[PDB]
Amino acid sequence: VVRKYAKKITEWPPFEYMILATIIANCIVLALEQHLPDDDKTPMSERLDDTEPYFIGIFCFEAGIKIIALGFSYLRNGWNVMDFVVVLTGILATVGTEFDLRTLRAVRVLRPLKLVSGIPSLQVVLKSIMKAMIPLLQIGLLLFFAILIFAIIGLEFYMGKFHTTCFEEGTDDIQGESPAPCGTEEPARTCPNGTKCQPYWEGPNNGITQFDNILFAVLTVFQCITMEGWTDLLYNSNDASGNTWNWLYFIPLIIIGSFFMLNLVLGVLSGEFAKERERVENRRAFLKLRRQQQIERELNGYMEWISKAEEVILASTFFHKKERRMRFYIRRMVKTQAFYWTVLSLVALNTLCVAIVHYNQPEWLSDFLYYAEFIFLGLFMSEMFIKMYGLGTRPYFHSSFNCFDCGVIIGSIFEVIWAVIKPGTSFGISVLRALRLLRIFKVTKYWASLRNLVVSLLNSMKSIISLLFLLFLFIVVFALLGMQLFGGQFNFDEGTPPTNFDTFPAAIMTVFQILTGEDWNEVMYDGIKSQGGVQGGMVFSIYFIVLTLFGNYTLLNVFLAIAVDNLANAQELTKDEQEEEEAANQKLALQKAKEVAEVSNQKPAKSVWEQRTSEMRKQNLLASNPLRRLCHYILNLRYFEMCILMVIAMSSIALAAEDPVQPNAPRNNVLRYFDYVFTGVFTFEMVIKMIDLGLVLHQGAYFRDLWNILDFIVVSGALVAFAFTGNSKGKDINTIKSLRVLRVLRPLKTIKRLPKLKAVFDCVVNSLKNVFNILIVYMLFMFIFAVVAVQLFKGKFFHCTDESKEFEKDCRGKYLLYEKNEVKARDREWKKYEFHYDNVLWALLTLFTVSTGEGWPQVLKHSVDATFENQGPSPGYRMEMSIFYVVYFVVFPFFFVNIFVALIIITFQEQGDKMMEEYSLEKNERACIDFAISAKPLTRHMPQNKQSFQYRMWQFVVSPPFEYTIMAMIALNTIVLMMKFYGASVAYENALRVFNIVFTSLFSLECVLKVMAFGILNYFRDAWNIFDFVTVLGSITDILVTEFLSFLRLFRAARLIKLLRQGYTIRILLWTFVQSFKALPYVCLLIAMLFFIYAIIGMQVFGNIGIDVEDEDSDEDEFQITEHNNFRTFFQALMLLFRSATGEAWHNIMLSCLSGKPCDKNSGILTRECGNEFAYFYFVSFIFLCSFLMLNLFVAVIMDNFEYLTRDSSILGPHHLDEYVRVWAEYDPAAWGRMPYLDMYQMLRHMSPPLGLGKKCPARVAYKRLLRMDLPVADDNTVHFNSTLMALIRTALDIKIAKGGADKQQMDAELRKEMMAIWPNLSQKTLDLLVTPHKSTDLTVGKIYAAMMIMEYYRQSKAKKLQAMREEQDR
Ligand SMILES: CC(C)CCC[C@@H](C)[C@H]1CC[C@H]2[C@@H]3CC=C4C[C@@H](OC(=O)CCC(=O)O)CC[C@]4(C)[C@H]3CC[C@]12C
Ligand SMILES: CC(C)CCC[C@@H](C)[C@H]1CC[C@H]2[C@@H]3CC=C4C[C@@H](OC(=O)CCC(=O)O)CC[C@]4(C)[C@H]3CC[C@]12C
């Protein structure tokens, strides 16, 4: 909308830079604002606020220039639309205030996003991120359906249960400060003497967490899906209803909601990243990278060649000819391996020296280390100068390695002077010298893989920096939005939480915490509480839901894409140089023959990632002693090995029944006799295995096999335990109790014997070998962080229970603790924090806890409040220490962990399958042909027993009006289950129940109507029909009983699943992954054994700890071993290991299991001697092993369906072939198996390529494919179902399509042999059915169609042929 073209003036480069500058200034101004409660302003607020007219005027001016120049193509760009709305909303608020316009100020948060619009480079990177998450939307649709279904189920069971508590008998007052749900029955929690269970209490978490509405249930379910706070619901519902069945709701909720969805997200993303790599634009960048590396390798060889010759030439520089030679002499020494290894050994000493430091080191140690730092610093500075003079200033500095040595040397000087100026702060910068230890990988074969990874990372440094900036920008926008929504609103009566949005530094760290998903629910409760409460502030949960939902998967997308792309580049880059080096050597040796002519392990076959990646490259490019013989005999006997397997199974079950709490329980007395028998069986099999084999190392030694030692340990420990008990039963209880623990190795004896369980075990060990080299780098980097953390926070993690006292001497005596309406006297104690950094070993445990993500907000709070050594905390003292934990998250949890996930995906090997390159085809041609081997037309009845009645009523059942009626009722029926709510009137409850009777009637008619139409037998052969039938039968059952609990009507809640069949891509994705879990049963078994072994160890070691202990102190973090969480039974142990696997405060459980804890009343121990220091190893190893085994399960399921995940719609695939089946069912309604060919051409028109011709295909081109079919034509006009499906696949995939003539005679002979070679199981007659034996007598499918296409080309010419003479005749 302009005056056409009239002196329209365009932009010049400084203009957009001025715009960029003003945007950055506006961002700073927004970041400098502080919000105060209740209409209070800071003095700087007015000065910052009055700047808004200038910024809005500049933005309006630039928008005006652009709008007049383009002419209002301004709104064509999406970025300009975002710019326009920013300008529009600002002017409305800035100019005029009559309407309520405080809300419109919230739109200013989007202004930082104008950086993306201004900088075109950021737009390209932003396009990459959004492109990958387009497929992920279909996962979100599965996630929403899962949440909806579980919200309905939770609504039915848990509606309103949490509103009763232990009220005082006399008054309507809560008994204690912390209330819990109660019950009036024994299974539920019972109130003490002084109280009773009264009707109304607000509920847990101030009533925010509950199941009262469908909206409350959906929000509550979403919280459990994120695995944050889900155990508190499990314990609360156990108090209300008893613990018999509540685990059936929550355990499936976590597995399906959290672990299964995470599997699809990794699967879909990994497939997308594989397809992105083989894009034409991405391949060209890699090809440039490969060529540039080849130049560097060759150039390095030539540089050393001339360098050696230059020294050959060399043989007051003129007088001191030696002066040139000392430069040459020490140049030699630098190169020598003696120098290289000697300086490297010095680095090991320096790395050791900085690790010794601890909180109270002896004074002699401090003096030694104080001088040793100068000695090490002096040696490395001298080592700098020797290379500088020895190699020259220019050659030295140009080396990348030497520049890094310069930085640490310069940094080390900075620290020592900094210590003198400002004593009290040491950063331990010298530890960065330990990174030189990674050069040791050069001697190994692993250097090529590691160097190439760093090469690829440095190549894409520009992309990585842009990715982090965009990720940082979205944090700033959400931080600014949080300040607007929750400003000075967190000033609660109790106090202002540490996580508040008052200031910009506080808003970033609160937003960052929600992204990591730790205690995001706790922050949500504060945000809801600030705005009214549960009554009025429930709409503010959307800010937290969107932030954690988007942040969870945006972080995964950004960091996994970085890891996959760079690791895949390194693998290809490494493989190419190895084959290039091999090929060049063979060529050189061949050339060596001409010169002399005058006188003349096994590498695994690629991987699932590499094999698929190579195929996509081709397809894209193509388109462009008498006793011993006895002892050997028993071992051969299958009954013996089958018998011993049964004994192993029974031995494991015995370990699970034993009662830990009662050593003298009657059950343990009975089970003790069983222990004698099981050892006896294991003793007998041990000796005969020694007799059949040999103890001595004769290459068949019994002790040679590793599992044999494992068998030897179990039996030996049991025998020795008997000897100690034999002498005196209770002389030494400690060691015998330790030896009894070795029985937990009995389940591991199963792995060797079961063949497929051993195979799964070898795959897990194979994965460890691949990631071992990265694992060493991971620990070296984590070691550096631990040493730095020690220097920062050594001795500063001390506090006094009395806040005021900040020294140990002051913290003595008693103090007054002011609780609500009561004063209590408590002792003053100078105690250390639970997790601290007093040495490198304590630092690593603390950082490991932070890596798992649990409890790090508390560790961060302690880190910022630390003041000085041996002095107490002060709130907000050092707020710059937050940078330590932000940098730590970027490196290890975000970056290294996704390298571990990527590395396993790229290097995963095939599941057996023998060799698989002997057959030429392989690839995806198998799956399509395999389907063609086994297929059948979907039989549609067409009974004709009674055309008027029975067939007619059939056509109604299949009629679209009936089907859409079915979908409408199921949709309406679901909404009926969604309208239950707490406090509904008896009229409302009755009205809802009436609609149930209406629906269950109609849903019964559908079953009656289908059964008659389909028949008694055919109907009952479809899984959904039985599922539908059991659902109607269950619902109708309850109704009669009421007039003459209905949790089996929640089967009707599962009817919503039927709606999934309409959405195709979801149904295939859900079905394929489910099938993959069935094909991998032993992988699931390995995870079950890990839980079994760790459960039995927990019962024997940590079972004795008492739970009855409770006191007014109520240090809940101190005591996490309670009635709900303990090791007392096998099932109570498994729940503890599942809570820890999800990560719910596992670090506090580990501390609760340590030594010096009260024992149980009946444990038989009368002193406070319970728990072990084994709790450190018990939990730390479990978290590593549980995450590793679960990850291998994920990749196994992902890499099983990797063909589908990396599918392309253009190229034929097995998923397409199902479309052929439904079409064939209709054109052949009776499913005769024979269809006349006049229907066939119409069939090909209906289906899109590559399976069908498609609507817009040229007729003559369509005829070309028809000849390509080359199949015999039946004289009844029919085409076989199996034979026809074969050729359509062959035509599309170009599977050895012959040039014609004699070739067709050979390929049919050939292809039939491949399919015979692949499977000899297929029937020969059926094999000839799919591919007919060649018969030139039978006319091909082309021949009938060749009648039209060849003649129609002539037929149009025939009219022109008669024409050609005709105008010539007239002329
Ligand atoms: C690169 C790696 C292999 C270096 C070697 C490991 C060190 C980082 C660790 C291993 C064991 C640790 C030690 C384990 C226990 C102690 C005892 C601790 O002394 C006390 O508890 C009290 C001392 C006193 O009061 O005299 C001092 C630290 C020290 C030596 C630790 C220092 C750090 C050490 C040497
Ligand atoms: C999942 C696989 C590995 C099999 C499941 C093994 C355990 C979960 C089961 C198997 C036998 C069960 C036990 C069989 C019998 C009893 C007695 C039963 O009676 C009692 O209350 C104790 C007896 C008494 O009071 O004298 C309590 C549960 C318990 C220990 C059971 C606890 C759960 C056990 C150990």
Ligand SMILES: CC(C)CCC[C@@H](C)[C@H]1CC[C@H]2[C@@H]3CC=C4C[C@@H](OC(=O)CCC(=O)O)CC[C@]4(C)[C@H]3CC[C@]12C
């Ligand atoms: C994904 C990654 C790249 C984004 C991580 C965001 C960081 C850039 C943010 C998050 C926490 C922030 C810190 C939070 C707290 C402080 C203390 C504060 O410095 C003070 O001394 C303020 C005094 C006070 O607040 O009492 C402001 C800077 C700093 C280090 C902040 C610097 C910027 C940090 C590291």
Ligand SMILES: CC(C)CCC[C@@H](C)[C@H]1CC[C@H]2[C@@H]3CC=C4C[C@@H](O)CC[C@]4(C)[C@H]3CC[C@]12C
């Ligand atoms: C060999 C495999 C099956 C081990 C199975 C042993 C289990 C099933 C048997 C063996 C010993 C049995 C216990 C022996 C002792 C008692 C105490 C008695 O007053 C009640 C039954 C009870 C609690 C039995 C329960 C079942 C029990 C634990």
Ligand SMILES: CC(C)CCC[C@@H](C)[C@H]1CC[C@H]2[C@@H]3CC=C4C[C@@H](O)CC[C@]4(C)[C@H]3CC[C@]12C
């Ligand atoms: C085995 C050791 C290394 C730690 C155990 C792994 C688990 C407990 C840790 C390691 C990596 C961590 C995750 C790494 C990736 C992300 C980024 C974002 O998506 C949410 C946080 C989240 C989800 C972290 C939460 C917890 C996490 C999954």
Ligand SMILES: CC(C)CCC[C@@H](C)[C@H]1CC[C@H]2[C@@H]3CC=C4C[C@@H](O)CC[C@]4(C)[C@H]3CC[C@]12C
């Ligand atoms: C990637 C490898 C080399 C890790 C080394 C980098 C780590 C150890 C460095 C990088 C940035 C550093 C922080 C930068 C600034 C400060 C503020 C200062 O008042 C206390 C130390 C503290 C908080 C530093 C601690 C150490 C730190 C986190």
Ligand SMILES: CC(C)CCC[C@@H](C)[C@H]1CC[C@H]2[C@@H]3CC=C4C[C@@H](O)CC[C@]4(C)[C@H]3CC[C@]12C
């Ligand atoms: C598919 C869509 C259109 C339907 C879903 C919305 C229905 C099922 C939901 C959304 C809004 C909900 C209502 C919101 C608020 C209240 C008031 C409360 O005192 C009782 C429950 C009640 C009455 C809820 C019942 C369930 C409800 C009606």
Ligand SMILES: CC(C)CCC[C@@H](C)[C@H]1CC[C@H]2[C@@H]3CC=C4C[C@@H](O)CC[C@]4(C)[C@H]3CC[C@]12C
């Ligand atoms: C594979 C495991 C067993 C090897 C690791 C051994 C270390 C980390 C663990 C395992 C067994 C542990 C010991 C087990 C029992 C006790 C008794 C306790 O009152 C003091 C600590 C002490 C002495 C533990 C110290 C730490 C310990 C030695």
Ligand SMILES: *[C@@H]1O[C@H](CO)[C@@H](O)[C@H](O)[C@H]1NC(C)=O
């Ligand atoms: C507490 O209740 C139990 C329940 O029967 C009763 O036996 C006991 O005497 C009560 N205690 C007191 C102090 O009344």
Ligand SMILES: [Ca+2]
């Ligand atoms: Ca958590």
Ligand SMILES: [Ca+2]
């Ligand atoms: Ca977590």
